[PDB]
A paper describes a structure:
[name] (also known as [name]) is a member of the [name] family of helicases, which are highly conserved throughout evolution, and function in many diverse cellular processes with the role of maintaining genome integrity. Specific roles have been established for [name] in almost every cellular process involving DNA, including transcription, replication, recombination, chromosomal segregation and DNA repair. The Zn2+-binding domain consists of a pair of long antiparallel α-helices (also known as the helical hairpin), followed by series of short helices and loops, from which a cluster of cysteine residues bind in a typical Cys4 tetrahedral arrangement to a single Zn2+ ion.
Numbering used by the authors: 10 to 318, 324 to 453
């Protein structure tokens, strides 16, 4: 019938869904279906970005080419589509010489039955694929060009791939077919690189998940100032778990830390000080690991202390150590409050921790340089950490600092962080921090 009916029908019949995850996923999908614009989709990992090109591909008359970096995830995408009985093929390196011969044979065929073709950037840019490609171009088969993991064009997206800089010329040969670019990487620098590198037609239809979540209360505490660090964390956990309601503990929480030793010790200290906490790290047997995870999920143990890692009622996330990046901190802290109820995100910052993490990052970079020489991209790793340091040391709204990093508008923070609740208090704490290293 109408556009909405076709979409709703395929959504249910093919993919098995009664609705879209979000109005944003819906709007993005409809903009791809309409086919009048180039489209940029920027949503977190797991938001269902794939549907935004997979579904309109099936509604189109031609084939959809999808460029994706790693064959592993490609195969998982293909396997998933195969379970949906979707006619999906993948051209990459893992294919044998005859397997390519058969896939090429279909694409060179009049009215091929390949609907969606996954391909790596190297294969899409290989001199061997150009004949098959030029045929598709000139015979006007192509409905969509999809560039997944579009951040790979960027020296600032933490996974730069040279072959992704070849996709722009490829797209320009196709003024006929709309281009859809998708990624979870949400910085303005990366977005600008994507638009230019893929030669996207302007104005681009942008569908981007807003970062600001008003039910999360962010604050930064300076370990240098805390007289009783374990007691401080204990009280933070108990408050968040609904201590003052006197109806028993409610919800759960996570404490992130860098080392297994801190993990084990924090779990001990918290348990001794009045909140049941269990350690979770790679040094444990996978047995004990699975047990602790379940005890947390099943709310037998309210607090998990973790070195690594989606429950809906996470009332707090505390970072005992500053994270390696702003993106990392945002994703980790953002595990709190998925049910929409009030939650607390606290970062325990210390300049000693800052120095140690900065040191470790630069040691990692140096290892990479010994391996494959200097790269333009190595500054990105440092800057991503520096943005989180600024977040900790700066006076201003915590939600705003996060928004700035992702290029979002000014958050309507209604006393939703420590700075906005009491700016003078935060300024006083920052002044005490400077005095701690004074004469
Ligand atoms: N409308 C929807 N309703 C429910 N689940 C969905 C919907 N769209 C996608 N999903 C599911 O969400 C999961 C994440 O999809 P994926 O495309 O891998 O996310 P992303 O690419 O954004 O990381 C997939 O398992 C997919 O089946
Ligand atoms: Mg994806
Ligand atoms: Zn604020």
């Amino acid at each position: 019938s109408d556009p909405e009916r076709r979409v709703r029908s395929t959504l249910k019949k093919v993919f098995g869904f009664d609705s879209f995850k979000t109005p944003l996923q819906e709007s993005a999908t409809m903009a791809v279906v309409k086919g009048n614009k180039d489209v940029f989709v920027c949503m977190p990992t797991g938001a269902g970005k794939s549907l935004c090109y997979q579904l309109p591909a099936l509604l189109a008359k031609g084939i959809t080419i999808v460029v994706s970096p790693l064959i592993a995830l490609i195969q998982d995408q293909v396997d998933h589509l195969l379970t949906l009985k979707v006619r999906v093929s993948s051209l990459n390196s893992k294919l044998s010489a005859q397997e390519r011969k058969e896939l090429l044979a279909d694409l060179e065929r009049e009215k091929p039955q390949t609907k969606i073709l996954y391909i790596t950037p190297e294969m899409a840019a290989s001199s061997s694929f150009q004949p098959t490609l030029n045929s598709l171009v000139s015979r006007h088969l192509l409905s969509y060009l999809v560039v997944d993991e579009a951040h790979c064009v960027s020296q600032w997206g933490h996974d730069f791939r040279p072959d992704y800089l070849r996709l722009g010329a490829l797209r320009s040969r196709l003024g006929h077919a709309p281009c859809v670019a998708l990624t979870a990487t949400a910085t303005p620098q990366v977005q600008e690189d994507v638009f230019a590198a893929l030669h996207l037609k302007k104005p681009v239809a942008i569908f981007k998940t807003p970062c600001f979540r008003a039910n999360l209360f962010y604050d930064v505490q300076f370990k240098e100032l805390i007289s009783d660090p374990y007691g401080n964390l204990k009280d933070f956990c108990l408050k968040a778990l609904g201590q003052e309601a006197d109806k028993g503990l409610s919800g759960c929480g996570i404490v992130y830390c860098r080392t297994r030793e801190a993990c084990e010790q924090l779990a001990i200290e918290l348990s001794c000080r009045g909140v049941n906490a269990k350690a979770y790290h790679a040094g444990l047997k996978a047995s004990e690991r699975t047990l602790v995870q379940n005890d947390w999920m099943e709310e037998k143990v309210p607090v998990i202390v973790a070195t690594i890692s989606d429950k809906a009622n996470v009332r707090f996330v505390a970072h005992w150590n500053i994270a390696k990046s702003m993106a990392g901190y945002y994703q980790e802290s953002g595990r709190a409050g998925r049910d929409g109820k009030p939650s607390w995100c606290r970062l325990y910052y210390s300049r000693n921790d800052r120095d140690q993490v900065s040191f470790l990052i630069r040691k990692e970079v140096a290892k990479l340089q010994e391996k494959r020489g200097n790269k333009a991209s190595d500054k990105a790793t440092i800057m991503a950490f520096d943005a989180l340091v600024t977040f900790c040391e700066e006076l201003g709204c915590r939600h705003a600092a996060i928004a700035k990093y992702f290029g979002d508008a000014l958050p309507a923070c209604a006393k939703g962080c420590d700075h906005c609740q009491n700016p003078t208090a935060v300024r006083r704490r920052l002044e005490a921090l400077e005095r701690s290293s004074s004469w």
